[PDB]
Every structure is written in structure tokens, then in C-alpha cells.
């Protein structure tokens, strides 16, 4: 697979270098390409690098904007984006051009790095339980969750029971508050019969500010 | 650069029915070497794009065979013989014949399923948040279809405006439903001025509005 670096806040005019660690295949055997996904969901190819010799080929629109390097000894590829403006806020993917039955196409993608260009400062969220009660029961099931309030920028990562509880989770799109800060909730539906034995913990990781919160969500007593 | 134009730009297909998406390229994608470098990708909500088909018609080996592609040198069609819940998302064509690589704009596929009414839940503010001076009340509408729903907040049976925000999930890749939350935010002072907090939910799967409420401090 391919493992990209976490999300980035970047001041306008500044630069940032994002990375893409390759594992499980021969690094210098395949091109590593980089793709920008703008918030309107348009995809554009940025360029590619030959990890064997460091040779780069760039989309002409990103010539002054991106530079591709590679570190053989750490089988990791890097894209540096220069002199950033509002138009460079987006999700950046790396992808391996692989081969199958004698043809070439993009066959492994990293998960994306969100870059937000802003002069505002990063700010970690406050996390509050949404406790289950008689007002959040239906059909013998209970809903519960966490309110993740007042952070900047996107994205914040929410998981439940350290990744073990995924079925029935809904982590909603963030809303933009009048303050210019974001909030979201993440909820899960569970058996109501098991609220006395199971433990439900929402894990919140807001990497831009290096903020991590675990909140155990319990019934009100 | 080569222009890739997709049509339609969105469509909504009932589970089990066929779907068809086309792409036109502004020049022949037939390379000198006899190959036609036209690819199709799917991007599900929350995921990276994924190659479905390359060389117009060749299926990636992990792709189910209800997908097929056809085409000439300039016009191409991706067909799903019978859509399933996991086919949701945005579909892109991509040409690799001429530098630079270029994608189309994307066609968003929604999966139509049977009408499902929301299950509605309401959450008072936590004591933790109250201590800090604000009260968020959350109303949750879970696993409904189609996505249009109306939420109204009533406080001591007076309709509220201007003090709430909502957002709706992407479509679910397993059951094809949506969920929505609506959050009412007051100061702690204004919260403590009132007794009954209610959200009233309208949805075409409901024959009258559904109300979930609590009394402050129970």
C-alpha cells in the first residue's frame, strides 16, 4: 500500500512538503504519480516520478507549483507545493502506476492529504458526549455519540473503540459556524440491552493542532 | 490538453436496474501503438478513486463483471448491468494517450432504494458543555431515504429560527440511506430560560411530522 502524511494548515505564500511511504512492492519498479482533487471534486494529474533515478515529468500547470522527490532508503516519495494560494487548498493523492496482464494503470492509491491554505491559526476541538437515554431509543436500539466542536481546519478524525466499532457509525460532514470554526457529531446505534456491559469510547484526533481526545460515552444516571 | 466531457453529470438508478455513463474526448485516443488509453474510475464517498476499466473495456481483476465498457476512438460508455448498493459515488473517465493525463468532470451516481422513514433521536446538552457556558441540542435522523427531510426546532412550543445548523451524510454504501443531524445552539443562560426542547421531523416516509422532545433537567 501507500501511506500519505497527515493534513496540513499552511499560511499563504508559504510552502509545504507532503509524503507518501510505499510498502510491500519494489519501490524503484513503478512510477509514483500525484493527483489534485479540488473541493468541486475535479481531478487533475500533477506529475510523476521514477523512483529509480529521480526523473520527474510534470503537468505544465504545476511546473512552478510542485516538485517531486524520492528517498530510496526510506521508500518514500515527496511532493513539495510552493508559494501557496487559496486555489491550492485541496486533497492531494499519490498513486502507483502498476501493471496487470501486460498493461499499465493506477492500481494503488494513498488515502489523500488535505491541505488548507489560511492565515488563521489552528485550534483543537472540544469533545462532549451525546449520552443514550429514553429519548434516543427505538426498536430496542440506542443511539449515542460525540459532539466535536470548534476546531480549525478540517479534517478531524473520529473512530469508536479504537477502530473496533464501525458498523452503524455516522460521522457527519462538518458545519461551518459563524465564528469560522467547524463542528461535527459522530453517532452510533447499538443494542439497548448491552448498555450495561459494553463500553463506548469515541476517539478524536485533530492532527493539525496535535489534539487527541478519548471520551467514554455513558447513559445518564 | 485533451478535454474529457462526461454525460450525464448525475443520475439516480434503482437497485437492480441498469446504468449507463458516457464520455467524449476532444481527439482520438487511439495511440500509434494500436492501444486506446481510456480508463474509468469510481470514487466512493470517503475513498480514493479506483480504476474499474482500462484500455476502454478491460476489467481490473478485482472488479465485478456487471461492469463493462465500450467505445470508438472518441466516444465511450461505461455500463453497469444491474446496480448494487456499492456502486454509489462519482465515476470518472481518464485518458492516458496524450500528455498530459486528463480526467472528465465526474458523474455522480445515486442508488435509488425503497422509501425509508428516519428514526429520530434527541440529545440534551452534556453537563460538561453546560459548565463551559453553551448548550448544543442535537436532533438525529437516522437511515432514511430519499434524502430530503425537514427539521424544525420548537422551544416551549415556539418555532425557532436562526440558531441551528444541519448536515446530511453521504449516501450509505451498504443500505443506500442517508442520516442527518440538526444542532440547536443557545447560550447557557438562554437554555435555562426554557423547559421543553423539541425537534419536529417531516419526511415522505412519514404521514405526519414526528416529534422528539425532552424537559430540561430530567
Amino acid at each position: 500500500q501507500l501511506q500519505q502524511s497527515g493534513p496540513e494548515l499552511v499560511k499563504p505564500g508559504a510552502s509545504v512538503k507532503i509524503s507518501c511511504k510505499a510498502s510491500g512492492y519494489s519501490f524503484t519498479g513503478y512510477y509514483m504519480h500525484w493527483v489534485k482533487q479540488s473541493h468541486v471534486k475535479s481531478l487533475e494529474w500533477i506529475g510523476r516520478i521514477d523512483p529509480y533515478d529521480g526523473a520527474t515529468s510534470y503537468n505544465q500547470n504545476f511546473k512552478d507549483k510542485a516538485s517531486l522527490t524520492v528517498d530510496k532508503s526510506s521508500t518514500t516519495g515527496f511532493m513539495e507545493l510552493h508559494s501557496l494560494t487559496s486555489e491550492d487548498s485541496a486533497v492531494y493523492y499519490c498513486a502507483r502506476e502498476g501493471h496487470w496482464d501486460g498493461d499499465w494503470y493506477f492500481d494503488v492509491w494513498g488515502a489523500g492529504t488535505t491541505v488548507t491554505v489560511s492565515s488563521a491559526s489552528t485550534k483543537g476541538p472540544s469533545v462532549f458526549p451525546l449520552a443514550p437515554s429514553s429519548k434516543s431509543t427505538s426498536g430496542g436500539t440506542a443511539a449515542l455519540g460525540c459532539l466535536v466542536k470548534d476546531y480549525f481546519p478540517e479534517p478531524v478524525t473520529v473512530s469508536w473503540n479504537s477502530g473496533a466499532l464501525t458498523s452503524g457509525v455516522h460521522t457527519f460532514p462538518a458545519v461551518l459556524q459563524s465564528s469560522g470554526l467547524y463542528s461535527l457529531s459522530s453517532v452510533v446505534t447499538v443494542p439497548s440491552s448491552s448498555l450495561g456491559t459494553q463500553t463506548y469510547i469515541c476517539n478524536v484526533n485533530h492532527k493539525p493542532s496535535n489534539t487527541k481526545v478519548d471520551k467514554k460515552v455513558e447513559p445518564k444516571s | 490538453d485533451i478535454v474529457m466531457t462526461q454525460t450525464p453529470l448525475s443520475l439516480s438508478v434503482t437497485i437492480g436496474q441498469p446504468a449507463s455513463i458516457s464520455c467524449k474526448s476532444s481527439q482520438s485516443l487511439l495511440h500509434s501503438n494500436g492501444k486506446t488509453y481510456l480508463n474509468w474510475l469510481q470514487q466512493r464517498p470517503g475513498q480514493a478513486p479506483k480504476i474499474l476499466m482500462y484500455l476502454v473495456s478491460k476489467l481490473d481483476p478485482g472488479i465485478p463483471d456487471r461492469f463493462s465498457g465500450s467505445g470508438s476512438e472518441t466516444d465511450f460508455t461505461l455500463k453497469i448491468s444491474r446496480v448494487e448498493a456499492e456502486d454509489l459515488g462519482v465515476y470518472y473517465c481518464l485518458q492516458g494517450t496524450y500528455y498530459p493525463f486528463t480526467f472528465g468532470s465526474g458523474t455522480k451516481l445515486e442508488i435509488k432504494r425503497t422509501v425509508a422513514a428516519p428514526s429520530v433521536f434527541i440529545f440534551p446538552p452534556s453537563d460538561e458543555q453546560l459548565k463551559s457556558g453553551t448548550a448544543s441540542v442535537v436532533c438525529l435522523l437516522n437511515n432514511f431515504y430519499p434524502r430530503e427531510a425537514k427539521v424544525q426546532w420548537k422551544v416551549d412550543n415556539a418555532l425557532q429560527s436562526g440558531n441551528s445548523q444541519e448536515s446530511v451524510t453521504e449516501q450509505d454504501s451498504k443500505d443506500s440511506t442517508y442520516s442527518l443531524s440538526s444542532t440547536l445552539t443557545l447560550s447557557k443562560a438562554d437554555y435555562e430560560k426554557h423547559k421543553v426542547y423539541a425537534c419536529e421531523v417531516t419526511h415522505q416516509g412519514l404521514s405526519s411530522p414526528v416529534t422528539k422532545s425532552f424537559n430540561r433537567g430530567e
Partner: peptide, 11 residues
């Protein structure tokens, strides 16, 4: 021959 190759639009 162990060297990367790919679709012609990459260069």
C-alpha cells in the same frame, strides 16, 4: 527490465 513504464500521457 525492472524499469517503470506507464501510459504515454505521463510523458
Amino acid at each position: 527490465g525492472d524499469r517503470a513504464d506507464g501510459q504515454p500521457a505521463g510523458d
